[PDB]
Amino acid sequence: MRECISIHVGQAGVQIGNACWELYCLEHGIQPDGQMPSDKTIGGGDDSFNTFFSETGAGKHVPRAVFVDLEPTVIDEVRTGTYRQLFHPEQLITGKEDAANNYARGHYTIGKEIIDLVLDRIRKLADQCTGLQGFLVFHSFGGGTGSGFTSLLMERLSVDYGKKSKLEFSIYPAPQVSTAVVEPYNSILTTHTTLEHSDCAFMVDNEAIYDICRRNLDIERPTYTNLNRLISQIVSSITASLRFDGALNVDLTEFQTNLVPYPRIHFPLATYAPVISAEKAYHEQLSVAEITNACFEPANQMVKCDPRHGKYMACCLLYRGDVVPKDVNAAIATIKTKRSIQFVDWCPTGFKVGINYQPPTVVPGGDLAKVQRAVCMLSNTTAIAEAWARLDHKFDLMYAKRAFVHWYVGEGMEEGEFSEAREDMAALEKDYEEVGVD
Amino acid sequence: MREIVHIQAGQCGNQIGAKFWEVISDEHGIDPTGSYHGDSDLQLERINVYYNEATGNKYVPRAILVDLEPGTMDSVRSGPFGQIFRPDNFVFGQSGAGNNWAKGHYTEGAELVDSVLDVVRKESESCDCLQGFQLTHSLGGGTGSGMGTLLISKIREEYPDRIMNTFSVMPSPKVSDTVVEPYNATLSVHQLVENTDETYCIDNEALYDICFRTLKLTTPTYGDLNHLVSATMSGVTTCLRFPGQLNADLRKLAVNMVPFPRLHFFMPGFAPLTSRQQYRALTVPELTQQMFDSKNMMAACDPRHGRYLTVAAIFRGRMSMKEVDEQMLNVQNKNSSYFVEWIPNNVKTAVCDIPPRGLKMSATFIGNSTAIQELFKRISEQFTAMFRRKAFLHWYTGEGMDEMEFTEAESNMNDLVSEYQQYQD
Amino acid sequence: MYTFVVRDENSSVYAEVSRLLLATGQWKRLRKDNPRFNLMLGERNRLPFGRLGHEPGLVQLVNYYRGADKLCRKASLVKLIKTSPELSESCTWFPESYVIYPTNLTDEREVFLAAYNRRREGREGNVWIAKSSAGAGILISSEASELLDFIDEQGQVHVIQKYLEKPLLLEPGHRKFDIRSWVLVDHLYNIYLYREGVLRTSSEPYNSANFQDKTCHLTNHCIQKEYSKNYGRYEEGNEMFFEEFNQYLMDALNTTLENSILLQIKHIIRSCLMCIEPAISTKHLHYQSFQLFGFDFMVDEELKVWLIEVNGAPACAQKLYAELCQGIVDVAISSVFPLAPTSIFIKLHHHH
Amino acid sequence: MEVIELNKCTSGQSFEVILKPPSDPSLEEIQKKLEAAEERRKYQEAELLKHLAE
Numbered sequence A: 001m002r003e004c005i006s007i008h009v010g011q012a013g014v015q016i017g018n019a020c021w022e023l024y025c026l027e028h029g030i031q032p033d034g035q036m037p038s039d040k041t042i043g044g045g046d047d048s049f050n051t052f053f054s055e056t057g058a059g060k061h062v063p064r065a066v067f068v069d070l071e072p073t074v075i076d077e078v079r080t081g082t083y084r085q086l087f088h089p090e091q092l093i094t095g096k097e098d099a100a101n102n103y104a105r106g107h108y109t110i111g112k113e114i115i116d117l118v119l120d121r122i123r124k125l126a127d128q129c130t131g132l133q134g135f136l137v138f139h140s141f142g143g144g145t146g147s148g149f150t151s152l153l154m155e156r157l158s159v160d161y162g163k164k165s166k167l168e169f170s171i172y173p174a175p176q177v178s179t180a181v182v183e184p185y186n187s188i189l190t191t192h193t194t195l196e197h198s199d200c201a202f203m204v205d206n207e208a209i210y211d212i213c214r215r216n217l218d219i220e221r222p223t224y225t226n227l228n229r230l231i232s233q234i235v236s237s238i239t240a241s242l243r244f245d246g247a248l249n250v251d252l253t254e255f256q257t258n259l260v261p262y263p264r265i266h267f268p269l270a271t272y273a274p275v276i277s278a279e280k281a282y283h284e285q286l287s288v289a290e291i292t293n294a295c296f297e298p299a300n301q302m303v304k305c306d307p308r309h310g311k312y313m314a315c316c317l318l319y320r321g322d323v324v325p326k327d328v329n330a331a332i333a334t335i336k337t338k339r340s341i342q343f344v345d346w347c348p349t350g351f352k353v354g355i356n357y358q359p360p361t362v363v364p365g366g367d368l369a370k371v372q373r374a375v376c377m378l379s380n381t382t383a384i385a386e387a388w389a390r391l392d393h394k395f396d397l398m399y400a401k402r403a404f405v406h407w408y409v410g411e412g413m414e415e416g417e418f419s420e421a422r423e424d425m426a427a428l429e430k431d432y433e434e435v436g437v438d
Numbered sequence B: 001m002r003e004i005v006h007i008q009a010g011q012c013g014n015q016i017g018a019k020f021w022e023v024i025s026d027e028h029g030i031d032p033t034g035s036y037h038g039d040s041d042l043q044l045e046r047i048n049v050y051y052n053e054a055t056g057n058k059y060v061p062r063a064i065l066v067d068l069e070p071g072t073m074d075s076v077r078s079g080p081f082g083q084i085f086r087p088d089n090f091v092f093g094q095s096g097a098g099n100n101w102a103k104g105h106y107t108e109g110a111e112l113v114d115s116v117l118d119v120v121r122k123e124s125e126s127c128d129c130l131q132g133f134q135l136t137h138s139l140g141g142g143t144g145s146g147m148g149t150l151l152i153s154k155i156r157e158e159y160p161d162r163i164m165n166t167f168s169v170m171p172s173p174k175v176s177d178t179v180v181e182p183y184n185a186t187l188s189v190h191q192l193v194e195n196t197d198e199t200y201c202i203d204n205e206a207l208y209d210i211c212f213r214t215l216k217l218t219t220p221t222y223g224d225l226n227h228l229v230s231a232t233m234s235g236v237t238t239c240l241r242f243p244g245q246l247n248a249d250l251r252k253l254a255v256n257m258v259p260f261p262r263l264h265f266f267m268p269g270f271a272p273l274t275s276r277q278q279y280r281a282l283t284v285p286e287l288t289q290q291m292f293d294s295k296n297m298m299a300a301c302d303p304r305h306g307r308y309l310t311v312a313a314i315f316r317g318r319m320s321m322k323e324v325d326e327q328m329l330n331v332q333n334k335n336s337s338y339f340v341e342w343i344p345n346n347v348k349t350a351v352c353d354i355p356p357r358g359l360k361m362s363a364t365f366i367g368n369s370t371a372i373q374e375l376f377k378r379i380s381e382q383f384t385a386m387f388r389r390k391a392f393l394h395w396y397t398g399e400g401m402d403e404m405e406f407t408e409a410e411s412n413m414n415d416l417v418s419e420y421q422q423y424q425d
Numbered sequence C: 001m002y003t004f005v006v007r008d009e010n011s012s013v014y015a016e017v018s019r020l021l022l023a024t025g026q027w028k029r030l031r032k033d034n035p036r037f038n039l040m041l042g043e044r045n046r047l048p049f050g051r052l053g054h055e056p057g058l059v060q061l062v063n064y065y066r067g068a069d070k071l072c073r074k075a076s077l078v079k080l081i082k083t084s085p086e087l088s089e090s091c092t093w094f095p096e097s098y099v100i101y102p103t104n105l106t107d108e109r110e111v112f113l114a115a116y117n118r119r120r121e122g123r124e125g126n127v128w129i130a131k132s133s134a135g136a137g138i139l140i141s142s143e144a145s146e147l148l149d150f151i152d153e154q155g156q157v158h159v160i161q162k163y164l165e166k167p168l169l170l171e172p173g174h175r176k177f178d179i180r181s182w183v184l185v186d187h188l189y190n191i192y193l194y195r196e197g198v199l200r201t202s203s204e205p206y207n208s209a210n211f212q213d214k215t216c217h218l219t220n221h222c223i224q225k226e227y228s229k230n231y232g233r234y235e236e237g238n239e240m241f242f243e244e245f246n247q248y249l250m251d252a253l254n255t256t257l258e259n260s261i262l263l264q265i266k267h268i269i270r271s272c273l274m275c276i277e278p279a280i281s282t283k284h285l286h287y288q289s290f291q292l293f294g295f296d297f298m299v300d301e302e303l304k305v306w307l308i309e310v311n312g313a314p315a316c317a318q319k320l321y322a323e324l325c326q327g328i329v330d331v332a333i334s335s336v337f338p339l340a341p342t343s344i345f346i347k348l349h350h351h352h
Numbered sequence D: 001m002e003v004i005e006l007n008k009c010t011s012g013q014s015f016e017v018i019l020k021p022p023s024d025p026s027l028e029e030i031q032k033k034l035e036a037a038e039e040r041r042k043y044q045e046a047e048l049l050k051h052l053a054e
């Protein structure tokens, strides 16, 4: 068994992770007070769920996670919520004033005074691990912390844990749920300083999660609670291979091995289905060919874009529930003859399939209905390049006038790091076009 | 606990801040004795932003009343919410400022400034994590304008990393106390361009024309004007006083609202503004048409003449946050030629469940428009009309000022208008 | 008050639509770089499709289908037909074509020579035509050596297809001609055929013994108006509309435009568009698409309709601009952004 | 349509299906950027105090 440490940076990172560890305890049968009746090995053991949870002498199953925020309001929710007895105070770290949506404030000014503290707390968790696999970093591109302090943490993690793997769960900024303006700057700044240090990042667009809350769940004004409960459902499907028995995506190394051929192009796309409203009278259960066939509809993409005009480099199908391999192959064959699935010539045209018989656990009193079989597809598509273009265009429209550049320059940062990072993104879009277009 | 230190200076600064504390004390459910008597926990959620917690569950506003004469503060202490304030936060002299910017900034005000900064230090030291300072005052008098700017110059020196917002009432010959109001304004405007992160411009002519014409008030008075500013100040501070998805501090708000360090002068608006047909529930489309209407703005500037860099609207009351996104996203896509197309998504909206006292719903408007240059153009005109003849300068040269410093304040404000201009094209 | 943008100042078709929209008083044009819009009249090449459908509270519509160039490129179409099962390589209405890359850059040079050598081996016609998307650049010749050499002198992709040696000829005149149909595809993928069409004829008698003087062979409206000497003799601007042509088919051949040609044009159009539907549709997309096409057809002496190419940015006839543009607004735009007949189109039903 | 590497266990199974064959900064350097930034804040804040001094 090899452990996996979780790190949540910023409000988005903290809240999301908080909903995740709620879903984890329900999926593994872990009570709010930490007790796990099914766990017969008391005080220790090398089971598949122990990669996320540790065990005390008193039978308390504690997560291997860390919550870091520069303002205490969001983390105090964890210090007093339903699952307050899970974490101990070491894992919850809070500053006093935030980075005011400023990246320079999260990377330099403020982050400099707390960076050593977070590493010391992450160290304590690594000291319990017999074989640390790496870290999963949850953060937002928009926040000053999730963008600024995250990159600084990532840069350090590569120094103290060189051979370890680091995955990301990044919240891509959507103006529909955000009242900020300087988000395009933070995003391009955090992606330039974290690129060489992240082995695989899964982007979630608040705009995509938002619509799925209105179109499928019939929620007129989705809140962060609605958005988080859905995001954690995807986080669960992508991390169950590390928390259960199986052979597909068993350790963090296999995420890059299976999903990332080229180093800089490490941004898969996530597609999930079904998403049914609990308020519905009652839904006819979809077949395996139906939920699988839905993994190609944009409405169920964690990032809005058109893969029909891109090329694939990898493709994983993580099923959960009543799914048999026979049905997966048939559904796959039918999808090829109808869909446009163009792979790159230097990669085989294939799919890696993983099946977990436990259906998706739904939070009691939640927005999602209980389904008999759900699937989450991960696929490295050059179509995801659409997301970098939109964000780059906004960076240019503002930077062309130096709008807001003084708040950043006023925290010690140099203006060159704006064009220095923008030049890098211009290269990233250049790599996607070399691999997808003719 | 993100505390804010409130300073109100001068006759206007105190009379307005007095009603301000009288307005938000009612929303948070705090009687004139500091006792809480509300029925909702949202009232106490972020209550420590403006109120300190004393013994016996008493809530004492974190304000510092400043003036160089006793009159205006004798009425506050003995007025409606006079007892709520801290008895020691009353810092005042006896000579007065004689509506002279030099007496508040260089001579009389300089003699008292130290004792005020000592009170500020008592309120700041006990702050768990200070957000910043907000100052209410007028820019056409002596104390608030003169000593107010001095008090800002000395607060940044001791707190160079704290945010500083001002509610600055601009003078207007249509509602004029003295003829030297252009001078006192031009001198402070440069101090605000330098040492303030956010200045809300509140023209008295707009406030007067808003009462006379819209509110059908035949004979407006200073009190009636202060009612508007009270409702407006309450509106813009909602994000910092009540909870919800919108978690914000002054720096977080200033970062998204001020694209250039010197163009931080906001012109606010409020709705509804109904005369006594006053109980008719105002539809969402009605609040959004007035809130974006020139007649409903308090800077006396025609927005259609300039361009918006950023615009924020905050609604209050139990309404449809879905229809809200619709009506706002309507006015934008119907009058977009007035928004700069190089700041993506500059128009944003928030919703608060707690409405002002006695309103099904309201809407505050916080605009950062280049059209505010019209406000600095009228001042500069009235200034030059007198300064060219050196009229009334003896009140100032007698206090120790040179004519050179007047020519500088003029040139500094003319640059401000030039800087606002290049962004309008 | 709807909002739109104009990013193609050269589109005569959508310069007229933009004028009508403003004439209704309920549309407001913005700067070509303003993002808050409902309808975009984008550019031809490199249209930023990736930025659409991302403005909150804005339903957005564009006048192009992303990926439709598969049907509007010389070589791209010959490849689509041969590789798409919906069309197969034995396509009956598309002249036997071959994609030929110059020797200075797959390539069907050998497959072409295999078919060219069997025609000459059976005393059959062997007149081929060379042409590329990089033309204003066409060569007609019965010699395979002159064709492949004319392509080596170029530097782009050329296509060599069989030249119809027996095209239908109008009378009097003994002259060649082509047919241009305008198809409008809305956002629901309903295929609308314009009831009106144009015949771009040649004012020179067709001569099957001289392919050098390319005037009596290429019926382009720009080649007859520059190299021909009988322009405007038989019909104005070498444009014969369906009324007079349908009137000619009844006098000389004893048939009707609908039965002998229009039934096939109404069939070729359905085939080309339904084929690429699974690739270019915007049914479940975040934005919406719609585009006007220009189907060029050949008609031989046996009253058979052939498909030459499909224009993506097609111009319209001077006498049909007003009627067709008004229809574009009624069906393509007003259906999406309604306002506050007897359709000029012939809807071609199909199975989505 | 070839299925390879079929691994079965108690709580699931995994496999691969092939349809068609194929056709850093050190710690010294990170301390300089952070301190270099800390110096430009000291510099700017120094100018501010020297400006308020005048």
Ligand SMILES: Nc1nc2c(ncn2[C@@H]2O[C@H](COP(=O)(O)OP(=O)(O)OP(=O)(O)O)[C@@H](O)[C@H]2O)c(=O)[nH]1
Pocket (backbone or CB within 6 Å): A009, A010, A011, A012, A013, A015, A016, A069, A070, A071, A098, A099, A100, A101, A102, A106, A139, A140, A142, A143, A144, A145, A146, A147, A171, A172, A173, A174, A177, A178, A183, A206, A209, A224, A225, A227, A228, A231
């Ligand atoms: N999906 C989702 N997005 C969130 C959530 N909370 C915040 N966001 C998004 O995150 C962005 C704001 O950045 P934050 O992460 O909240 O800011 P931060 O990380 O705390 O950094 P600072 O505020 O500068 O201290 C906005 O785009 C929000 O839409 C959440 O709970 N779920």
Ligand SMILES: Nc1ncnc2c1ncn2[C@@H]1O[C@H](COP(=O)(O)OP(=O)(O)CP(=O)(O)O)[C@@H](O)[C@H]1O
Pocket (backbone or CB within 6 Å): C095, C129, C131, C135, C136, C161, C162, C163, C164, C176, C177, C178, C217, C218, C219, C220, C296, C298, C308, C309, C311
């Ligand atoms: N296989 C073929 N058989 C007979 N004639 C042909 C032919 N291919 C092309 N032509 C002639 O060439 C003309 C079309 O030329 P082509 O379409 O290749 O150039 P172009 O695309 O610039 C003209 P358009 O404006 O219609 O797109 C037709 O008028 C037709 O008479």
Ligand SMILES: Nc1nc2c(ncn2[C@@H]2O[C@H](COP(=O)(O)OP(=O)(O)O)[C@@H](O)[C@H]2O)c(=O)[nH]1
Pocket (backbone or CB within 6 Å): B009, B010, B011, B012, B013, B015, B016, B097, B098, B099, B100, B138, B139, B140, B141, B142, B143, B144, B145, B169, B170, B171, B172, B175, B176, B177, B178, B181, B204, B207, B222, B223, B225, B226
């Ligand atoms: N809205 C409003 N404006 C005021 C009030 N009192 C004074 N003013 C304005 O402020 C200016 C005079 O400033 P003043 O209050 O005397 O400043 P002070 O000398 O520091 O007390 C005049 O131009 C008035 O228009 C008030 O109660 N309400």
Ligand SMILES: CC1=NN(c2ccccc2)C(=O)C1
Pocket (backbone or CB within 6 Å): B165, B198, B236, B237, B239, B250, B253, B254, B257, B312, B313, B314, B366
């Ligand atoms: C007081 C302040 N209120 N605000 C503010 C800005 C936008 C919306 C709501 C509030 C500031 O920036 C300073």
Ligand SMILES: CC1=NN(c2ccccc2)C(=O)C1
Pocket (backbone or CB within 6 Å): A179, A180, A181, B239, B246, B248, B252, B253, B256, B257, B310, B311, B312, B313, B314, B345, B346, B347, B348, B349, B350
């Ligand atoms: C309400 C709020 N409006 N805003 C805001 C910010 C930038 C532009 C427009 C609006 C806040 O920060 C909080």
Ligand SMILES: [Ca+2]
Pocket (backbone or CB within 6 Å): A039, A040, A041, A042, A043, A044, A045, A046, A047, A055
């Ligand atoms: Ca155990």
Ligand SMILES: [Ca+2]
Pocket (backbone or CB within 6 Å): A158, A162, A164, A196, A197, A198
């Ligand atoms: Ca590494």
Ligand SMILES: [Ca+2]
Pocket (backbone or CB within 6 Å): B095, B108, B111
């Ligand atoms: Ca004295």
Ligand SMILES: [Mg+2]
Pocket (backbone or CB within 6 Å): A010, A011, A071, A098, A099, A143, A144, A145
């Ligand atoms: Mg934050």
Ligand SMILES: [Mg+2]
Pocket (backbone or CB within 6 Å): B011, B141, B177
């Ligand atoms: Mg006075």
Ligand SMILES: [Mg+2]
Pocket (backbone or CB within 6 Å): C309, C311
């Ligand atoms: Mg052409």
